[PDB]
Amino acid sequence: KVPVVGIVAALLPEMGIGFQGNLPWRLAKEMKYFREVTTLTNDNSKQNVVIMGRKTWESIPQKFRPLPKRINVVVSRSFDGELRKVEDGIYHSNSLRNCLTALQSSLANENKIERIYIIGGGEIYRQSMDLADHWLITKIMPLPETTIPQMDTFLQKQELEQRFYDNSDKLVDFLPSSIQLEGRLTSQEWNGELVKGLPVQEKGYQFYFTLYTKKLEHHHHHHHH
Ligand SMILES: NC(=O)C1=CN([C@@H]2O[C@H](COP(=O)(O)OP(=O)(O)OC[C@H]3O[C@@H](n4cnc5c(N)ncnc54)[C@H](OP(=O)(O)O)[C@@H]3O)[C@@H](O)[C@H]2O)C=CC1
Numbered sequence: 001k002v003p004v005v006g007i008v009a010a011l012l013p014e015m016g017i018g019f020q021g022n023l024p025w026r027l028a029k030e031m032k033y034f035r036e037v038t039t040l041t042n043d044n045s046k047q048n049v050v051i052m053g054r055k056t057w058e059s060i061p062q063k064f065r066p067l068p069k070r071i072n073v074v075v076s077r078s079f080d081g082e083l084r085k086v087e088d089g090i091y092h093s094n095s096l097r098n099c100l101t102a103l104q105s106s107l108a109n110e111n112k113i114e115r116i117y118i119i120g121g122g123e124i125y126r127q128s129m130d131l132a133d134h135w136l137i138t139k140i141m142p143l144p145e146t147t148i149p150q151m152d153t154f155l156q157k158q159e160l161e162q163r164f165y166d167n168s169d170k171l172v173d174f175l176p177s178s179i180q181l182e183g184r185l186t187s188q189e190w191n192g193e194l195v196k197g198l199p200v201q202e203k204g205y206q207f208y209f210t211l212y213t214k215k216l217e218h219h220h221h222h223h224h225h
């Protein structure tokens with residue numbers, strides 16, 4: 001009943017997302033977009049949930065964690081229940097799946113969660129493909145004179161394109177109202193593939209914010225009791 005959305009920044013064409021436990025880059029403008037999207041909501045009385053793998057949590061500077069104004073959920077095979085508070089703004093879960101079921105219960109959340117964001121972990125992203133309804137992806141490209149950074153973690157681009165389709169024409173509509181961007185929706189060919197979204201440039205990088213949505217399904221069966 002509450003939308004499950006994955007959000008990530010990836011460097012084309014392989015979609016590298018991290019290197020040696022960190023980000024391969026440092027771009028102020030990209031962190032700005034991520035912070036505003038996950039934080040802002042359409043209903044002022046609601047907050048968004050940010051769910052992340054345990055390793056992504058340890059990569060966030062201690063000064064900025066937990067992420068402010070958002071319900072934080074860290075998942076680890078070594079935690080206790082399916083969803084339990086451990087500190088202020090922090091929930092611990094031993095199961096990403098049961099964690100979602102629990103969050104969906106309107107008895108527990110009393111309909112005060114606008115969205116559920118899956119904000120990180122290559123390992124977490126791989127299990128989200130069936131779980132998520134949508135995907136917010138920042139596609140990054142090094143400019144001509146820029147060196148390509150090294151990377152060791154990647155988004156599963158294949159699974160993404162089997163279940164989801166590029167819905168960027170609806171990116172602006174999909175984001176919370178209060179957010180404003182400094183570009184116009186643009187289509188640019190880069191290394192063969194089509195890159196559609198909102199354009200930005202910082203340091204020696206060119207990047208685009210995009211949106212992915214689940215594909216239609218055939219009607220094979222509905223459970224009758
Ligand atoms: N550019 C971007 O948009 C982002 C990039 N990153 C990058 O990704 C890298 C880290 O990702 P990665 O190494 O994959 O680690 P993850 O963040 O995905 O953490 C994986 C851990 O999460 C726990 N876990 C995984 N699945 C489940 C489950 N189903 N139920 C309960 N717990 C589970 C396990 O923790 P445990 O071992 O404790 O049991 C596992 O070890 C870093 O380099 C980081 O910079 C991260 C976020 C965003």
Ligand SMILES: CCc1nc(N)nc(N)c1C#C[C@H](C)c1cc(OC)cc(-c2ccncc2)c1
Binds near residue numbers: 009031
């Ligand atoms: C913008 C990066 C980012 N962009 C997009 N489009 N999606 C994302 N999911 C993330 C992300 C992320 C993880 C949680 C992260 C990693 C990190 O270092 C690995 C530092 C921060 C961080 C530093 C400063 N303030 C808040 C958060 C966040």
